[PDB]
Design a protein around this ligand. Structure first.
Ligand SMILES: *CC(=O)[C@H](CC(=O)O)NC(=O)[C@@H](CCCCNS(=O)(=O)c1ccc(O)c(C(=O)O)c1)c1ccccc1
Ligand SMILES: *CC(=O)[C@H](CC(=O)O)NC(=O)[C@@H](CCCCNS(=O)(=O)c1ccc(O)c(C(=O)O)c1)c1ccccc1
Lengths: 173, 88, 88, 173
């Protein structure tokens, strides 16, 4: 049933979990006790921009991702329409959350306009760029700047363009 | 006592397209990469590690239409398989 | 007739360390990343796809000593598992 | 035995190959007939440099990698002590090789000094940089610039520093 906390996410049975723990040895990330763990996730989604077109349909993405991450057991913080500076501040605040200490993993989701150099903040234009680099996200979440997530999987998801090109070439059959 | 740890480890990034290239979004249906990721997570989180899931998402984009894109896994320092174990 | 194809697909890069960081080499023993990669390829090419092998190489570097480094998989657009099938 | 073409590489038995073809469906890259396929690999290794220290031990890496790629069924081209411009020329020539048409995959191996921006050519110094970007390698081997390797796995291996940092942080137990 989809009426449980996991919603539409297919469950892993106890026999399935033991099979995975047998097909692979000690090459799996340890999972913390469900009763005590405090899993955290962060979604940053920019929809309304100063200069670039409105990201109509972003609400569908926010809804889908928020519900999915909750289904997977994460408490989801949703932040909207931020500049690159605001995103950095939010990421720094996320790295400082005490719940990471009693968590086994994290998810970071970024949804915005994007260019080759990175992700667009709400104030972005060609004249005055407002960009958050992927490099900066990693730096802010690494062992130096986020020791609480040491040895723990950190999944970063980015919905954004990475340039102007259509990403295709022609060939004849 | 103090001990050394890798400064960067246990990361995986998943981007909606390849470098230089566009990613698509529908005004009512949302972003295809996001929608595709949720569907695959819902289906495969029980049986596949996240890296495997991301590959499957990539595979679903293999046949290019008018709105072509190729999601890309980036800067991976996962040393182990990350299984979500949904329900546990 | 002409058909569309993804401009960038079926790539995997494997780097000797993480961005910003050094990679080690011994004057007589060679580069540890290279030596480690060969050993793992020799052992696991028969049973694991290259992505799995690269993860295993990463895992072998997990415990940091005086010459610490963390090999990184980069810009992956493999849509399928790449098995070497050695002997075939 | 290590006396065969595959040397020290453990062989995949026919039962093992069928098990892999059963555990995974049509989610495996197709392998071409062993009797007719023309697999190619390229190793670029810079050992002797104009300004930066000699990469002593590179010969061990060249030997190891060359033999391994041959064991795996690839014909290996080895190019040594090239500038970034020379590397680009060699990569372009490699992309033009007709054998790729009757190949199912390729390996590219780069071994040199490196900085954050990329791989050092033989003429590299701080005053006049001689750098090949990873981005350029991908571009030269993609579907546009190497249509022969369309749909075929392209494995890029880079042994090089990516900066000056030791890559470590301290924590207390
Ligand atoms: C480039 C970027 O950062 C954002 C990423 C994001 O918002 O998630 N991508 C886009 O803005 C792309 C989507 C534009 C919305 C168009 N969708 S549509 O179905 O309404 C539409 C409208 C008109 C058309 O002609 C088409 C069509 O089929 O061509 C579709 C994006 C994609 C390519 C170029 C620019 C922007
Ligand atoms: C930075 C770079 O591009 C190259 C990559 C490569 O050549 O593959 N990396 C290095 O040059 C690193 C290795 C230097 C060789 C030192 N090896 S050693 O065993 O002979 C040695 C000598 C003296 C020492 O003090 C040590 C030691 O244990 O510290 C070892 C490299 C690594 C770090 C910094 C600079 C260069």
């Amino acid at each position: 049933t989809s009426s449980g906390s996991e919603g539409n996410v297919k469950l892993c049975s106890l026999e399935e979990a033991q099979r995975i723990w047998k097909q692979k040895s000690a090459e799996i990330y340890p999972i913390m006790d469900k009763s005590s763990r405090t899993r955290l996730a962060l979604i940053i989604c920019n929809e309304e921009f100063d200069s670039i077109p409105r990201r109509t349909g972003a609400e569908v993405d926010i809804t889908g991702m928020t519900m999915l991450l909750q289904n997977l057991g994460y408490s989801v913080d949703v932040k909207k329409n931020l500049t690159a500076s605001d995103m950095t501040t939010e990421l720094e605040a996320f790295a400082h959350r005490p719940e990471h200490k009693t968590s086994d993993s994290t998810f970071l989701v970024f949804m915005s306009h994007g260019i080759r150099e990175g992700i667009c903040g709400k104030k972005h234009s060609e004249q005055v760029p407002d960009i958050l680099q992927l490099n900066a996200i990693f730096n802010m979440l690494n062992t130096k700047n986020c020791p609480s997530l040491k040895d723990k999987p950190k999944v970063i998801i980015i919905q954004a363009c990475r340039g102007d090109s259509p990403g295709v070439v022609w060939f004849k059959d | 006592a103090i001990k050394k740890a890798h400064i960067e480890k246990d990361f995986i990034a998943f981007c909606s397209s390849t470098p230089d290239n566009v990613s698509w979004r529908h005004p009512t249906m949302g972003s295809v990469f996001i929608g595709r990721l949720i569907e695959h997570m819902q289906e495969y989180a029980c049986s596949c590690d996240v890296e495997e899931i991301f590959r499957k998402v990539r595979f679903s984009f293999e046949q290019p239409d008018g709105r072509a894109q190729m999601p890309t896994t980036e800067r991976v320092t996962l040393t182990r398989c990350f299984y979500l174990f949904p329900g546990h």
